[PDB]
Amino acid sequence: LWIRPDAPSRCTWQLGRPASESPHHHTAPAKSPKILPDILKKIGDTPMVRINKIGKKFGLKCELLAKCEFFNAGGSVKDRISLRMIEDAERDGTLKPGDTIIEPTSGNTGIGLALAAAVRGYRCIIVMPEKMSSEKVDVLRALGAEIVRTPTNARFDSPESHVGVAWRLKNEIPNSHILDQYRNASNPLAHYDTTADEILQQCDGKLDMLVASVGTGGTITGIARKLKEKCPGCRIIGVDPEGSILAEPEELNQTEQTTYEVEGIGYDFIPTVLDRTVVDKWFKSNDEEAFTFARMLIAQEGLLCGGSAGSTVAVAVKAAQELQEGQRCVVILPDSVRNYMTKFLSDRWMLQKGFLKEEDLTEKKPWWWHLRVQELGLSAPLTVLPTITCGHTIEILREKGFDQAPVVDEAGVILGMVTLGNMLSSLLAGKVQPSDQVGKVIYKQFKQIRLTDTLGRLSHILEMDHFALVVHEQIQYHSTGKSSQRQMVFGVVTAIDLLNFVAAQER
Amino acid sequence: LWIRPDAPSRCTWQLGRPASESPHHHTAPAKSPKILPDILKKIGDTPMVRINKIGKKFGLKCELLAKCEFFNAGGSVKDRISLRMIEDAERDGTLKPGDTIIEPTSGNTGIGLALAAAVRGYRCIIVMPEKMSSEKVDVLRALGAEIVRTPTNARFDSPESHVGVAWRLKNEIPNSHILDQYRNASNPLAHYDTTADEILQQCDGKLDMLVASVGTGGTITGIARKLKEKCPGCRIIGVDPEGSILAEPEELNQTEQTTYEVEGIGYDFIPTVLDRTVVDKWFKSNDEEAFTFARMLIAQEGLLCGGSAGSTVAVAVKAAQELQEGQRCVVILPDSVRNYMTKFLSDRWMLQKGFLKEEDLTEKKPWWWHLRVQELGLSAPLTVLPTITCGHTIEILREKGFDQAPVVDEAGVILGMVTLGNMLSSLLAGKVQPSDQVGKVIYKQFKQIRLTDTLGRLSHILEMDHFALVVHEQIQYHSTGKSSQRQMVFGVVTAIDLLNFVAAQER
Amino acid sequence: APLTVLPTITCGHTIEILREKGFDQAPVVDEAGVILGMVTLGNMLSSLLAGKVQPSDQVGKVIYKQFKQIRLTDTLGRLSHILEMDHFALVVHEQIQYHSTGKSSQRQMVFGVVTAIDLLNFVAAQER
Ligand code: HEM
Ligand code: HEM
């Protein structure tokens, strides 16, 4: 009854057999029209870009090319299989308009299927592990797909695994089908028909290697099968995060931790779709190097790719040392950075997970990074009320030779800060009159900072707020059971002042 | 000295003059190579997709086509002008490797220039208004660009406006240049050379209308100029958010509020680059309709576009009522949803801003949405300790006919929940032994929910956590100055149970 | 029933605490978890006014020390049949917790206090 994903493959493919015996319906890469009737046709024909800086940093000699699969409609390499699966199910007559699609997946296939359903009108229910980022959840919500989260540490064949939940949901919902990516032949077939043909046409046939991360296994299986059928000289390199058992031989998989922060790759079972026989070698990868390489890719090549691309490049820079000049290597970058915006892209999260250490972050910063804000020539001899009139503020600011002053009330509550030039511009434009209160022109937001903080902290703060107020806090008492507090401003600092101080110190 | 952005244009262009008299260096859309040497070449050749559902919902009769400019390298329509500006400055000899680029912009151009600098090695300093989302800030940080935020309510010519800060930074940093988008002729020229040619080639020349949002003005100015030089029959429709003064005639701009949540479009000044004479009509737009139309686009067409595209489509569905069958309309979608992930894409933020009302959210939900969780057949007659052994939990769970039970300690602290099937699978796989504690298999996360909450709240919760524990809280006292608290679990609910209840109620 | 009180607690303490949280009645339970009964604010006030008790006195003089233990699974018909004998019925649940699965432990965990008043109010609300 239950079609488990760990069953051995029933296929009989082997090298050299002509395509005419294939039981599957093969289609060549279609030529895109002048205008595509629907967004679903914007899948495929992705570019192959040359890597320039990451390779030389590690002494790589071969031409390293990256398959930017994050430019697809859904921003992932899992839009191909979604489209192919939907098309095959529709052509088989299994799926009709208004039917329900249940897919246990890691979100990328879920996003692709949600997009397909929104375009074509299906009820899409997505079952995914809990550890996936909330970005995918939000995008799915906007696409009108129903989400079901499942525990991360649940064994694949357990009752509450993502596949198990999806299967029992299919068992109980009427007119519901599962296009299971772990077992459907359409998954590897999509790559076999489009991804491999695209690669061979774009690279002019000649290449010596290919590196691809492994989830469901189609992304590597189809490409490897087509390449070995056409260009067997290519070495197929697989990747697998620590804690997963996809990589072989087995002793490579002996590790204590079963959970990893990297997403979209690695599983505790061997998929039925996967064909490990066409894999020339396997590598293990960890979160730290993967995210670091993803950040390096973003910062030095402009490829806005996710963690899996980082893992792929980290493994490639190791595996491809054997290659010499004139030989070509290819890497498959699954998805975009969009799915990981608050994840590894955030320095906060990296430091919280420990994947980045303060020494690694600070060793490359300028010489003024560790200096305190105390080193600045900050000052703020005066302040004004928020109810004060505009012309009054103008005249008083000129009375004492300042162009800006903090705004504070009688109770000591800081309201913001106002600048002379902005007030003058507002008066000239007629937006305010001298008798009007400064509330129309006041800058009512700022960041409260302390003298003890370094200039690096100030720089990190100024990326969010223009003005930072250097303040101190004193607490005064009447019997030591009767407390009172107040804060007591010093000067107004901006990136302008910081850079002026840096320039003055340099000269 | 200071080149203000509000100065009138010095150009002398007028209809019908041949290109040979142009002082500018024009280049036709280049043919992409088989493999692009660097990612910067992945700008242009974007697809034009047909809109199908948004048009008919409002009775639109014309063929509505959207220019998906969010597929560019930087995911925005502001990668074109960045590339063109960099190329023109390099070809003019103004910019050398290692030079500093300062750009006051709304982030999209900043992101494009940061990508260009990362590829080519420039010091990129980005000055933007504060109201921009943190997504752009994070992406810029990953690209190695220095960010400076400026107040939103600062007048454009004020000392601390984004343009003013950028100009004075250029004034004080050595070897620093500004490629100002508000004044550089390259901005509109990029569209005039590529965007318009792409549109005319893709649509086979025939089209009757064009709708485009307006920021710097190039996105509309260049396309309109080329179209009127080649296909004058097209009606050029501009858009402008409330609070901005770009739209004409003036009385359209009379509104109380000067600040709007929409980003990337609308300014308090007329850019020097903008040519309003080639605009056939203008429209005003507001945040609510813009974000609603963006969400509708995402949910019904799969176009992962931002708020500006929503504004453009909202204005188009109004302006294009005059068109009849057989005529074609074009809309320019600036950027991707990536820049607005935690913004309007989030229902929380929409409700907080009031752009969505609870009645509008609830009127379309199922009939069971308002029912309390109290209507379920939930139960949890037993619980177990976390230190208990695996085999003990197995035997006891079978002793009483349950397959799952919450995990709680002596003190009353809830640790999680464990399922029989997962424990059996772990034992079979050898990951645990009967004597081992349940800590290796326990699901140590969940969401605490109350009986009073509706099933809609439970559904929203289950999109994040698989298991939700229905608990109650009682507080007990010894003298009414001596308090004590405890919580007291009821049953374990999942989307499985919710959907089973829905099915049972339906039948 | 968000709160409960001890049986040894004083009368004035129960008065003040009941007003502290806007309830007029609360179940009475001890430290061991044994349910003793339930006490109402109005009856306590009447007893204080009549002089039968003082604020420092324990609630034992005014507590309603009898009730019927009922389960969520039971129908309103069963509740109506029960209320013909006892005024108050306590909706409780029972959970049993274990340390090695040979070491059992039990406890019950009250939900709310129901009477014919509440039943008829629910019926009226549903009818309208
Ligand atoms: C070229 C000649 C091929 C032959 C003779 C062949 C043979 C078969 C057959 C007979 C099945 C059906 C097994 C069943 O229903 O029990 C099957 C399924 C399948 N085929 Fe092929 N195949 C060919 C090509 C390919 C290619 C090119 C791919 C991928 C690149 C592929 C991937 C698969 C997969 C993943 C399945 C599903 C196996 C399962 O569900 O157990 N096949 N194959
Ligand atoms: C086709 C014949 C054209 C002529 C004779 C012409 C004329 C000129 C001249 C002489 C300037 C320099 C003004 C100065 O430096 O003071 C200029 C600048 C400029 N041109 Fe053109 N132009 C032509 C085409 C175009 C086109 C096709 C576009 C855009 C689609 C364009 C947009 C601009 C802009 C934005 C400026 C900057 C104006 C300023 O900075 O004040 N021009 N034009």
PDB file of C-alpha atoms in Angstrom, chain A residues 155-229:
ATOM      1  CA  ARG A 155      13.059   9.232  11.279  1.00  0.00           C
ATOM      2  CA  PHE A 156      12.012   9.119   7.637  1.00  0.00           C
ATOM      3  CA  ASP A 157       9.786   6.044   8.049  1.00  0.00           C
ATOM      4  CA  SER A 158       8.314   7.258  11.346  1.00  0.00           C
ATOM      5  CA  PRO A 159       4.594   8.133  11.444  1.00  0.00           C
ATOM      6  CA  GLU A 160       5.192  11.901  11.642  1.00  0.00           C
ATOM      7  CA  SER A 161       7.981  12.305   9.097  1.00  0.00           C
ATOM      8  CA  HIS A 162       7.309  14.704   6.242  1.00  0.00           C
ATOM      9  CA  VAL A 163       6.871  11.818   3.798  1.00  0.00           C
ATOM     10  CA  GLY A 164       4.660   9.937   6.260  1.00  0.00           C
ATOM     11  CA  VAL A 165       2.480  12.965   6.962  1.00  0.00           C
ATOM     12  CA  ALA A 166       2.147  13.634   3.232  1.00  0.00           C
ATOM     13  CA  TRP A 167       1.252  10.006   2.519  1.00  0.00           C
ATOM     14  CA  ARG A 168      -1.417   9.819   5.217  1.00  0.00           C
ATOM     15  CA  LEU A 169      -2.832  13.183   4.126  1.00  0.00           C
ATOM     16  CA  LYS A 170      -3.148  11.738   0.625  1.00  0.00           C
ATOM     17  CA  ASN A 171      -4.749   8.656   2.192  1.00  0.00           C
ATOM     18  CA  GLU A 172      -7.455  10.758   3.872  1.00  0.00           C
ATOM     19  CA  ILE A 173      -8.136  13.677   1.479  1.00  0.00           C
ATOM     20  CA  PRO A 174     -10.312  12.889  -1.568  1.00  0.00           C
ATOM     21  CA  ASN A 175      -9.039  13.576  -5.080  1.00  0.00           C
ATOM     22  CA  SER A 176      -5.505  14.004  -3.718  1.00  0.00           C
ATOM     23  CA  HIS A 177      -2.277  12.852  -5.356  1.00  0.00           C
ATOM     24  CA  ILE A 178       1.403  12.872  -4.422  1.00  0.00           C
ATOM     25  CA  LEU A 179       3.960  13.568  -7.147  1.00  0.00           C
ATOM     26  CA  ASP A 180       6.671  12.245  -4.833  1.00  0.00           C
ATOM     27  CA  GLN A 181      10.046  13.635  -5.877  1.00  0.00           C
ATOM     28  CA  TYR A 182      11.862  10.762  -4.155  1.00  0.00           C
ATOM     29  CA  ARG A 183      10.291   8.144  -6.456  1.00  0.00           C
ATOM     30  CA  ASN A 184       8.925   9.847  -9.585  1.00  0.00           C
ATOM     31  CA  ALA A 185      11.076   9.219 -12.652  1.00  0.00           C
ATOM     32  CA  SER A 186      10.181  12.697 -13.921  1.00  0.00           C
ATOM     33  CA  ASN A 187      12.547  14.286 -11.381  1.00  0.00           C
ATOM     34  CA  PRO A 188      15.836  13.006 -12.875  1.00  0.00           C
ATOM     35  CA  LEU A 189      14.278  12.996 -16.349  1.00  0.00           C
ATOM     36  CA  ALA A 190      13.796  16.770 -16.269  1.00  0.00           C
ATOM     37  CA  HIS A 191      17.531  17.315 -15.814  1.00  0.00           C
ATOM     38  CA  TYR A 192      18.363  14.504 -18.250  1.00  0.00           C
ATOM     39  CA  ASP A 193      16.309  16.279 -20.916  1.00  0.00           C
ATOM     40  CA  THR A 194      17.069  19.959 -20.230  1.00  0.00           C
ATOM     41  CA  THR A 195      19.900  20.534 -17.743  1.00  0.00           C
ATOM     42  CA  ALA A 196      22.392  18.220 -19.448  1.00  0.00           C
ATOM     43  CA  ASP A 197      21.521  19.376 -22.965  1.00  0.00           C
ATOM     44  CA  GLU A 198      21.825  23.001 -21.844  1.00  0.00           C
ATOM     45  CA  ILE A 199      25.236  22.312 -20.302  1.00  0.00           C
ATOM     46  CA  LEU A 200      26.566  20.480 -23.354  1.00  0.00           C
ATOM     47  CA  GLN A 201      25.294  23.170 -25.736  1.00  0.00           C
ATOM     48  CA  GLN A 202      26.595  26.092 -23.664  1.00  0.00           C
ATOM     49  CA  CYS A 203      30.052  24.645 -22.944  1.00  0.00           C
ATOM     50  CA  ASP A 204      30.475  23.414 -26.549  1.00  0.00           C
ATOM     51  CA  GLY A 205      30.582  19.819 -25.339  1.00  0.00           C
ATOM     52  CA  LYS A 206      34.064  19.857 -23.783  1.00  0.00           C
ATOM     53  CA  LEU A 207      34.318  19.673 -20.002  1.00  0.00           C
ATOM     54  CA  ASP A 208      36.290  17.545 -17.560  1.00  0.00           C
ATOM     55  CA  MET A 209      34.358  17.622 -14.275  1.00  0.00           C
ATOM     56  CA  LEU A 210      31.040  18.335 -12.582  1.00  0.00           C
ATOM     57  CA  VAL A 211      30.266  19.007  -8.914  1.00  0.00           C
ATOM     58  CA  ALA A 212      26.697  18.855  -7.619  1.00  0.00           C
ATOM     59  CA  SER A 213      25.083  18.716  -4.201  1.00  0.00           C
ATOM     60  CA  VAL A 214      22.661  15.863  -3.577  1.00  0.00           C
ATOM     61  CA  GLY A 215      19.152  15.971  -2.157  1.00  0.00           C
ATOM     62  CA  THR A 216      16.534  13.899  -3.948  1.00  0.00           C
ATOM     63  CA  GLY A 217      19.366  12.781  -6.245  1.00  0.00           C
ATOM     64  CA  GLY A 218      17.870  13.770  -9.594  1.00  0.00           C
ATOM     65  CA  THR A 219      19.972  16.927  -9.912  1.00  0.00           C
ATOM     66  CA  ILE A 220      23.078  14.724 -10.094  1.00  0.00           C
ATOM     67  CA  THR A 221      21.564  11.487 -11.399  1.00  0.00           C
ATOM     68  CA  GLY A 222      20.058  12.817 -14.620  1.00  0.00           C
ATOM     69  CA  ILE A 223      23.004  15.039 -15.508  1.00  0.00           C
ATOM     70  CA  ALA A 224      25.501  12.253 -14.789  1.00  0.00           C
ATOM     71  CA  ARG A 225      23.552   9.715 -16.838  1.00  0.00           C
ATOM     72  CA  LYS A 226      23.291  12.009 -19.858  1.00  0.00           C
ATOM     73  CA  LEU A 227      26.942  13.059 -19.583  1.00  0.00           C
ATOM     74  CA  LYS A 228      28.194   9.474 -19.342  1.00  0.00           C
ATOM     75  CA  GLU A 229      25.979   8.650 -22.324  1.00  0.00           C
TER      76      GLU A 229
END
